[PDB]
Amino acid sequence: SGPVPSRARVYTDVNTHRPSEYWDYESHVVEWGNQDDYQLVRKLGRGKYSEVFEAINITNNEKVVVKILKPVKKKKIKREIKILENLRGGPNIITLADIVKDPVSRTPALVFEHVNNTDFKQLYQTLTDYDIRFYMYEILKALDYCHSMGIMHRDVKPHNVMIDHEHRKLRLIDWGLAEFYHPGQEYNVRVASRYFKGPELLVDYQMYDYSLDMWSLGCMLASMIFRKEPFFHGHDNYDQLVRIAKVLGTEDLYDYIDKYNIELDPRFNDILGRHSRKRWERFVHSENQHLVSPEALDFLDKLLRYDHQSRLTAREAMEHPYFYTVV
Ligand SMILES: Clc1cc(C[NH2+]CCc2ccc[nH]2)ccc1-c1ccccc1
């Protein structure tokens, strides 16, 4: 009878009630400006789909961020642009300022507002319990906003979250893997980075939704409060589910695949084993106890669930007792 259908508990029909203009990215008209207004300063990093540079807009002496895209697929560039234009101005969303092409290379490039990234290794050691709560709340504002706009990020991870700690400024970036949520649509499961992949992706359950971002967020929270990076350390996509099963246990995993009538790939047969459900308190040690609290553990337990429908939505997460000290 195949797998059981599923749809988001929130913002289910946001794209359904909007004109095609909004979500039909293949029909979006992209106006490529002139790259001569921008001077590249330094490389900020390298990715699978792009090279990111700190730059200066010479027409106003203002620092910008320039993302040079490896022009692999036109549909994908149009999708990211449309999503960035749709979300432009949303809370803690990277602001697309310009779309340019270098006159000679004609390589697509996206120009963004400047974010001054604090050294992560230096940041990690000095972050307090309050700082974790504060920045988690900031990502949640970004996620509630994009989910409200019918968009799922699908690549929530530390590398996609820019923090300027001096100014307590946070931006969610890299919307290249982002997609419009349409109820009942079957999506490609080959999204997100291995350590942050939700169980729905690993079991090849294609009818996923905004809740995928909430699992990824839970992985980030678990690594931060427990000082264990990454939290679920898989060596491959099949092993990744085994690492999750070593914490959440195999009984709840079989409950999830039975609820949605999922067929577990035969590659899981000899590696999954049998695992008891572990208490979150077991991950507490002398080096992380100052970041752990019963509220933090209760909130984590509500994000890291196999059942994507049982995870807190970004709005429900923002209302959790863990965030009382921030607002
Ligand atoms: Cl998400 C994050 C992320 C970082 C910082 N990365 C920045 C990645 C980057 C640099 C250049 C391109 N990308 C530091 C800390 C956190 C954090 C803080 C509080 C709670 C959870 C996570």
From Swiss-Prot:
GO biological process, one term: negative regulation of translation
Keyword ATP-binding found: yes
Oligomeric and partner information: Heterotetramer composed of two catalytic subunits (alpha chain and/or alpha' chain) and two regulatory subunits (beta chains). The tetramer can exist as a combination of 2 alpha/2 beta, 2 alpha'/2 beta or 1 alpha/1 alpha'/2 beta subunits. Also part of a CK2-SPT16-SSRP1 complex composed of SSRP1, SUPT16H, CSNK2A1, CSNK2A2 and CSNK2B, which forms following UV irradiation. Interacts with RNPS1. Interacts with SNAI1. Interacts with PML (isoform PML-12). Interacts with CCAR2. Interacts with HIRIP3.
Sequence similarity: Belongs to the protein kinase superfamily. Ser/Thr protein kinase family. CK2 subfamily.
PTM comment, free text: Phosphorylation does not directly affect casein kinase 2 activity, but may contribute to its regulation by forming binding sites for interacting proteins and/or targeting it to different compartments.
Originating species: Homo sapiens (Human)
Keyword ATP-binding: yes
Chief localisation class: nucleus
GO terms of molecular function: ATP binding; Hsp90 protein binding; identical protein binding; kinase activity; protein serine kinase activity; protein serine/threonine kinase activity
Residues of the full protein shown: 2 to 328 of 391
Residue span(s) of domain Protein kinase: 38-323
GO cellular component, one term: protein kinase CK2 complex
Name of protein: Casein kinase II subunit alpha
Tissues where this protein is expressed: Expressed in gastric carcinoma tissue and the expression gradually increases with the progression of the carcinoma (at protein level).
EC number(s) stated in the UniProt entry for this protein: 2.7.11.1
Signal peptide: none
